[PDB]
Design a protein around this ligand. Structure first.
Ligand code: HIS
Ligand code: HIS
Ligand code: NI
Length: 465
């Protein structure tokens, strides 16, 4: 009827908003701010805000908003939500250097100790979505949000059931129910869509695009976006030296990968950030050189008789990562590296054991809100939430720390390009491709979001015709 079936990769454990962006993606939760279809920060739950000085953020909330349990969205509710999320998530905590919050009625005041220009931006982060901390349910299973669809049931790591929240503040949502099921294999997601088991899928494997495009019952939406695929190194393993990272960097054939593995739905990467961003000064493009790699590995004493052994992790959720892994393995052998590929079902959990991997295929949304600061803080600082390999360089730290209190946007761009230049010399990770998000749906599904931030999907206008 008006029921939507969605199939996603990257199964969750907790679906608390501070653990995963899935609640924002599927329409259950909303952040104070958002980015619009053109990537600009906008007020969402906020009616007005002011910044009377560089340590004060005054927010007035809209007065017509309720949580899905009927409770009013007030400043005290936003205060308790933000404080809980900071307390429970390192990602949130490190993105929000908030020193204190006061609340009365619909107005809250957020204070910092010093200037943090990216505060408002990070309040648009989906991990900062607002939920009812007083709700009498487990926030890890059925958080209560302000979004158009309330989570009614959660089968852990498998299925999310949502129902229309009729009093949703923007208007009456257009679906009755939504069912979200996790499926890590991209080919399976496509088969599910083709057999109408599901109506809407993300992360379509590039080699299935043509098959879906030929189907008049289906439609494919591609978006160039700001997601980057990479080879992430484990810097806590002493064998993963600069020579080894440089060697592996030169075993990658980025242009070949973009042309043949992504079949043109990607561009070769240099820095974390898509080169279509005008102010980014990219480092030189690394071209595959097996002899150079072989040479570098001689610096650490590796030979055909005594090769470097690398345990490389991968996962199915982003369909092209394991295809890249396969050709890295084949090519690395020519450079006296024996790569063992291990595909895992729960990548975030697996990487927590730093003794269990040397490198990993990975993918990250490196600039979801128009600023490079988020990535540097989460990926290049010790204990940042996506710094799985524990990359840290005090010289890079210093620039990131300076960036964090830099207000002038032109100066931000300059410091950012300095960080890119300096960090690139370490080869903290090998960035492989800026690749398109590809979404496919039954032709009767209308008005879902496929926009460059790669976060949003469902809103109150998404429907079935
Ligand atoms: N950050 C990786 C792994 C992940 C699992 N869940 C969320 N992320 C990716 O998005 O592909
Ligand atoms: N899956 C999203 C969000 C995330 C946070 N941590 C890991 N992933 C990304 O990779 O950008
Ligand atoms: Ni991720």
């Amino acid at each position: 009827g008006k029921d939507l079936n969605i199939s996603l990769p990257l199964k969750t454990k907790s679906i608390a908003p501070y653990e995963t962006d899935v609640p924002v993606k599927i329409g259950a939760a909303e952040s104070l701010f958002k980015t619009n279809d053109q990537g600009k920060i906008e007020k969402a739950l906020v009616k007005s805000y002011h910044q009377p000085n560089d340590t004060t953020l005054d927010i007035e909330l809209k007065d017509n908003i309720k949580f899905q349990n009927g409770q009013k969205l007030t400043a005290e509710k936003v205060k308790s939500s933000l404080e809980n999320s900071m307390k429970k998530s390192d990602l949130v905590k490190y993105s929000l250097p908030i020193s204190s919050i006061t609340a009365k009625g619909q107005k809250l005041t957020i204070k910092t100790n010093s200037a943090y220009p990216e505060l408002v931006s990070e309040l648009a982060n989906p991990f900062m979505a607002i939920y009812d901390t007083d709700a009498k349910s487990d926030v890890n299973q059925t958080p209560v949000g302000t979004g158009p669809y309330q989570i009614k049931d959660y089968k852990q790591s498998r299925k999310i059931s949502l129902s229309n929240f009729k009093d949703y503040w923007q208007g009456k949502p257009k679906l009755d129910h939504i069912t979200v099921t996790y499926q890590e294999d991209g080919n399976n997601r496509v088969r599910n869509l083709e057999s109408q088991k599901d109506d809407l899928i993300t992360d379509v494997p590039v080699n299935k695009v043509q098959d879906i495009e030929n189907n008049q019952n289906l439609k494919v939406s591609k978006e160039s976006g700001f997601r980057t695929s990479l080879l992430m190194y484990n810097h806590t393993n002493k064998k993963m030296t600069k020579s080894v990272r440089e060697a592996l960097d030169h075993i990658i054939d980025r242009q070949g990968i973009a042309d043949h593995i992504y079949q043109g739905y990607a561009k070769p990467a240099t820095s974390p950030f898509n080169d279509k961003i005008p102010y980014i000064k990219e480092p030189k493009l690394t071209k595959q050189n097996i002899e150079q790699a072989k040479m570098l590995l001689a610096k650490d004493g590796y030979t055909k008789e005594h090769p470097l052994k690398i345990k490389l992790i991968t996962y199915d959720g982003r369909p092209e990562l394991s295809k890249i892994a396969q050709v890295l393995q084949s090519d690395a052998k020519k450079a006296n590296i024996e790569i063992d590929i291990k595909s895992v079902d729960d990548i975030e959990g697996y990487l927590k054991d730093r003794s269990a991997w040397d490198a990993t295929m990975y993918s990250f949304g490196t600039i979801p809100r128009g600023d490079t600061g988020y990535f540097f803080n989460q990926a290049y600082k010790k204990d940042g939430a996506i710094n799985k390999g524990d990359y840290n360089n005090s010289n890079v730290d210093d620039l990131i720390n300076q960036l964090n209190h830099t207000v002038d946007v032109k100066e931000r761009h300059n410091i950012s390009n300095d960080i890119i230049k300096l960090s690139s010399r370490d080869v903290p990770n090998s960035y492989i491709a800026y690749n398109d998000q590809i979404v496919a749906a039954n032709s009767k599904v209308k008005n879902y979001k496929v926009t460059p931030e790669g976060i949003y999907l469902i809103d109150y206008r998404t429907t079935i015709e």
